[PDB]
RNA sequence: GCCGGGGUGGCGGAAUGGGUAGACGCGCAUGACAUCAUGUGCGCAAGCGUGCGGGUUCAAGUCCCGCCCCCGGCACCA
């Protein structure tokens with residue numbers, strides 16, 4: 040009997056599929072129903088290890104499966120080559136972006152191949168290639184003609200390291216999404232913006248009937264931050280200008296004891312009295328250089344400064360002082376807020392800090408508010424000290440005060456969103472050029488459609504493209520010196536480049552027509568493949584990619600190019616992958632595990648000594664090491680940085696693909712985080728082995744046996760197996776359609792074990808033949824090699840043309856099941872009787888069990904509950 | 916503090932229209948020549964066992980009431 044050998048069959052079969060062209064997506068899916076399985080394309084930066092493969096595998100399992108079922112599958116793959124992620128990688132290794140990009144793409148593309156993964160590469164797409172970004176620019180123009188793209192000056196986020204501006208969504212915890220060790224800063228500058236906010240309502244209203252992870256949906260709702268309320272106009276004293284503010288508590292208007300303007304608000308300086316004019320300019324610019332991190336380090340000791348001007352409370356008419364404090368966001372509402380310390384803990388704290396007035400106008404139902412208040416009372420209540428509103432309820436009060444302000448023309452009801460606009464212009468070389476020219480006479484002029492693409496200046500000098508503070512294209516007149524396509528005089532091309540997230544925002548749409556030189560894609564085509572039925576990815580693109588794509592699809596929908604309005608119908612979010620990591624040497628002494636500083640620091644814990652127990656309790660262990668000392672190991676995220684990756688190729692060579700697949704899809708539940716391990720792999724070896732042995736050993740017999748027969752005529756073990764078979768066929772089919780792989784696999788390990796047992800007694804019957812035909816077909820998605828291999832010992836064509844096994848309902852039916860006999864609620868034993876056996880039969884069969892405990896325990900019995908399914912309770 | 920999801924074996928994890936808890940796998944332990952085969956929730960035992968405390972029921976991981984700890988999210992309203 041031969042043995043299972045990966046190398047001998049793996050690469051073999053891989054070529055076979057590639058050449059046979061099975062996962063080649065059709066152009067316009069017929070009435071066969073389509074399936075668009077797609078995983079987020081990668082950032083060509085770094086080598087591919089196992090942690091990275093978890094997502095593509097699943098997409099492969101899924102794609103293969105759907106393919107067998109007959110659906111027209113589209114399982115594209117490509118590269119998110121342009122932007123900061125890539126360029127920053129290259130620049131780190133002093134390599135030229137274009138070289139570094141095509142280097143990874145080559146490697147990465149090999150790994151995937153070495154894994155059994157099949158794409159329809161006739162659709163590969165590289166974002167940084169002119170053939171692609173050509174269209175980023177064509178889109179950008181169409182957005183401009185619809186006034187969705189524009190320029191504007193103001194403070195923006197700046198990443199010193201990246202040496203460019205970042206969108207708000209690229210500022211995770213006031214730090215760069217890439218350099219979580221670099222505190223983002225603020226700078227005055229004029230950039231480009233996409234009016235995503237013009238889609239704030241739809242972007243929210245459509246999240247409703249969506250089948251996505253709660254976590255994601257939640258986050259977007261918070262990022263969009265819709266907030267119903269009112270815009271109130273406070274007349275400034277002496278001047279003509281009226282200052283507007285936003286609030287959700289118009290019912291506390293009489294509580295307004297002072298206004299507050301954002302340090303960057305226009306009037307903050309145009310109102311500050313001369314004697315203060317200096318103190319304001321000092322603080323205004325002080326709040327600027329203050330990084331978000333620095334702000335969030337003050338707690339509630341917020342700062343502020345009195346301008347020197349006053350305003351009139353459009354409700355009472357009294358003169359309230361006007362201040363300015365960083366806690367107010369120029370980018371939110373109207374950069375101005377009416378302060379009501381009595382009903383807002385943030386304002387309250389401020390008021391009490393700078394000796395400002397606190398005035399209650401909302402009374403708590405029942406137990407009166409302790410005067411003087413010691414804390415702002417926010418909850419609803421009754422309106423007091425509020426002119427003609429006294430005795431009204433906060434709730435009804437609002438719409439009233441609103442309708443009121445609206446009548447007097449002092450304010451209006453208005454909805455505002457937290458969502459700020461999208462800042463896409465970037466000061467980096469490696470990126471799409473913004474198709475705009477800056478004529479001196481006409482101003483900002485768009486490049487003609489046909490004059491596209493605006494090719495990127497070829498710069499083969501690393502030390503040149505390196506960002507120093509402004510677009511590298513600024514020192515290249517050969518590029519930025521052109522003529523205005525409007526008047527004709529001398530103009531200047533835009534030196535800034537679109538951000539990476541601009542191209543990743545519609546690729547899924549590009550794969551549907553990867554070679555279109557007239558349009559970014561043919562509507563007819565994309566309409567036949569969208570939306571994306573399944574979308575494997577990660578949650579780190581919650582407010583980013585998953586946000587922007589929705590915008591872009593809505594925009595493209597309005598141009599009438601895409602019929603849907605939500606790109607990703609389904610969306611899975613796989614979990615991290617960990618791996619036992621070496622943390623360093625330790626000094627064991629009995630039970631005391633003293634830690635040398637280098638190790639401790641790596642563990643990142645305050646303790647400098649632990650007990651053999653704590654080391655265990657924290658999930659670590661002590662191993663012997665090549666340096667002849669004891670090292671401490673403990674899982675950790677598998678990453679290059681950690682140097683605990685498990686390289687795809689170096690692995691498949693020594694082990695196998697299918698082995699890595701199984702070890703990955705059975706480690707734990709997909710969404711959970713697994714821990715790649717030796718034992719994990721060893722187990723996959725054994726599972727794959729036995730699958731092989733079993734079919735090998737009955738190969739000859741199988742060949743001379745026919746797999747045809749009449750099910751109803753089956754009896755005994757035969758009939759038994761036939762059930763267990765379809766029992767499995769069902770669990771497996773469902774588990775797949777629900778992305779629950781671990782169990783689909785185990786469902787197979789279990790039937791395998793079933794097949795072995797069946798041989799201990801029964802020969803090699805037709806049913807058994809069929810049992811293998813089905814086992815293989817089902818195994819395909821997980822171990823496509825070993826399956827195709829064994830499958831050919833008895834069948835001609837590839838598993839790809841076998842179809843998915845048809846489940847047989849009638850077969851799932853039980854007869855003579857195993858009921859459990861319990862005495863007085865406690866399970867005393869079990870018996871074997873039909874699913875229909877009447878109480879009399881069960882009672883009987885039970886009264887004489889192994890230990891006849893049902894008898895020794897039931898020497899009285901009163902009531903007897905009997906669930907024909909599997910229960911018989913003898914209530915003593 | 917609010918919101919979503921979670922606490923099950925030495926380990927990852929199965930099973931909730933109440934109805935042999937712990938499938939499948941790992942690990943361990945014996946029997947055979949790294950691998951198969953058998954066993955493996957805990958306790959010597961009475962007996963006990965799905966985060967804690969009550970309760971409903973012949974029967975509770977599943978249902979009711981009160982509560983703790985964990986993970987993730989937190990814009991507005993309340």
Ligand SMILES: CC(C)C[C@H](N)C(=O)O
Pocket residue numbers: 079080081082119543580584
């Ligand atoms: C779909 C893309 C936005 C995914 C992103 N390029 C990444 O690989 O992290």
Ligand SMILES: [Hg+2]
Pocket residue numbers: 120137140165167168169
């Ligand atoms: Hg390129």
Ligand SMILES: [Zn+2]
Pocket residue numbers: 198200201202215216217218221
């Ligand atoms: Zn950065």
Ligand SMILES: [Zn+2]
Pocket residue numbers: 478479480481482484523524525526527528
């Ligand atoms: Zn001009």
